[PDB]
Amino acid sequence: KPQLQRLAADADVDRMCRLLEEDGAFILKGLLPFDVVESFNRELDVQMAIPPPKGERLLADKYPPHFKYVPNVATTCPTFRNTVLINPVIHAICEAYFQRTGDYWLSAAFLREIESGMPAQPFHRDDATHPLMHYQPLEAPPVSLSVIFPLTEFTEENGATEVILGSHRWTEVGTPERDQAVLATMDPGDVLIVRQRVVHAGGGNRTTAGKPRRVVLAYFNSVQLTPFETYRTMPREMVESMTVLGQRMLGWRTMKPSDPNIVGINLIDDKRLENVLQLKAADSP
């Protein structure tokens, strides 16, 4: 079976862009150094250690108490906010991928941890958070890109993501067989990039030794689509410590869909949002 291509960080962007249209997915090998990965893991550990609140939790309250989830990791994990989120290889890919739709930003970035004994996900498309995506035709400009960060090893046994190459060209998901998929086996620091409409499934975790598989999922969307997570409650001090790119990703700046939108989006008083807010940024100068 044709496998997912593993590319070094210096790989050609045109090539990556074409990989996404032909195969629908690929892996960037060793993008994040191990020190970044381990700093990110420790920040995430802090969040998972927090005793559960007394109040409502929108997603978590639907699941049993052993559910492992960290929402909107950019507000609590400085390593993601300052290093992972603004990786220039990721954004080179995004800019080439989103060329026909225009600007993109971060819709969500969150931790999942899959424990030993968990079954695999059903095969699906990532068209549920913004259901209108389910009706976009294949040839329309893509509005969503999935970026999957393994924070432990992804192996065959512990549930490496199952991806069916070319499946973004299918009419429906149907009920595909597992052996039609290939495995995104990976080391921490690798990155898996998945095109809109590609049929895939988390592999669960069939190990029995008690070692959980840890994944951070980041969804970059056209700025036409409302971010699932809103970063508007970030303190000004935190917002201003980020770079312009980071501020743009977290919804703090006016953005531009492609023509025929010739004005922009996410603005106020006919001015750019960062101007009305007098937003400073770390790399303004």
177 sits near Co ion (criterion: CB under 5 A): yes
Cβ within 8 Å of residue 25, ≥6 positions away: 4, 19, 163, 165, 184, 192, 193, 194, 195, 198, 200
Q: What are phi and psi of 266, to 5 degrees?
A: 65, 55
What count of Cα atoms within 13 Å lies in the side-chain half-sphere of residue 193? 26
Active site residue 63: yes
Q: Which does 126 bind (CB under 5 to 8 A by kind): a copy of itself, Co ion, Fe ion, none?
A: Fe ion
- Least distance in angstroms from the C-beta of 89 to a copy of itself: 26
Report the run of H or E that residue 97 belongs to, with start and end.
Answer: helix 88-97
**Contact of 155 with 204, CB cutoff 8 Å:** no
In the list 87, 224, 249, 250, the residue contacting a copy of itself (rule: CB under 8 A) is 224
1 sits near Co ion (criterion: CB under 5 A): no
Is the bond preceding 260 in cis, omega lying within 30 degrees of 0? yes
Stretch touching a copy of itself by CB under 8 A, among 79-87, 154-162, 174-182, 222-230: 222-230
126 sits near Fe ion (criterion: CB under 5 A): yes
**Contact of 37 with 188, CB cutoff 8 Å:** yes
Closest-by-Cβ residue to Fe ion is: 126
Binding track, positions 58-97, relative to a copy of itself; x by CB under 8 A? xxx-x------x-xx--x----------------------
* Catalytic annotation, pick one of 63, 69, 97, 219: 63
Where do contacts with Fe ion occur on this chain (CB under 5 A)?
Answer: 126
Residues classed as catalytic: 63
